[PDB]
Amino acid sequence: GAMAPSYRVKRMDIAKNDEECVVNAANPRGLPGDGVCKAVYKKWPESFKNSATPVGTAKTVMCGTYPVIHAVGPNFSNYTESEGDRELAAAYREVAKEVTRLGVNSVAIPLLSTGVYSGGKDRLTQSLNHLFTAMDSTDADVVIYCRDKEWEKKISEAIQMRT
Ligand SMILES: Nc1cc(Br)ccn1
Ligand SMILES: [Cl-]
Ligand SMILES: [Cl-]
Ligand SMILES: [Cl-]
């Protein structure tokens, strides 16, 4: 565990993270995909061996000894708001199980279902709150990666508001 488990946010490529493992915003078929998934494929291509896993689940594959936790958030184009909400919460619970099982002291994590799976909606708050629900009982240092300056501000504010 981390000595004083924390949340942090950084605005940069999750492929350049400084943590002991990474969560991929994966697709169910283990394809190279777009956005976070394509950056992860470029950095850790070996981790996409048998990475396919259903919506609402996480599957870890090692790239050398570095764990890549493939977390499949729902595509809100396909799911109802209600079913999508349930699957998004579930993907993060499976990430918390994997992070715990791996025994890491830190994890780099994107906001699931906020990009091309958002169904063209702003899901920062919805995705972040599910992240907190899952990860709050873990003792890993959590570092959330984003690319948008205003998202960075909002995420930082949401973290600081609970400290
Ligand atoms: N490569 C990336 C892309 C996004 Br979106 C967030 C973090 N890292
Ligand atoms: Cl960068
Ligand atoms: Cl996404
Ligand atoms: Cl972002």
Curated annotation (Swiss-Prot):
PTM comment, free text: Phosphorylated by host on serines and threonines.
The residues listed in the UniProt record as binding ADP-D-ribose, with positions renumbered to this chain, are 13, 27, 35, 115-117
Altering residue 36 to E/F: what's the impact?
A: Almost complete loss of mono-ADP-ribosylhydrolase activity
Range of residues in the leader sequence: none
Residues in Macro domain copies: 4-163
Where does the UniProt annotation locate this protein?
Host cytoplasmic vesicle membrane
The protein's role, per its UniProt record: Seems to be essential for minus-strand RNAs and subgenomic 26S mRNAs synthesis. Displays mono-ADP-ribosylhydrolase activity. ADP-ribosylation is a post-translational modification that controls various processes of the host cell and the virus probably needs to revert it for optimal viral replication. Binds proteins of G3BP family and sequesters them into the viral RNA replication complexes thereby inhibiting the formation of host stress granules on viral mRNAs.
Q: What is this protein called?
A: Non-structural protein 3
Which source organism does the UniProt entry give? Chikungunya virus (strain S27-African prototype) (CHIKV)
Task: Give the shown range, full length included.
Answer: 1334 to 1493 of 2474
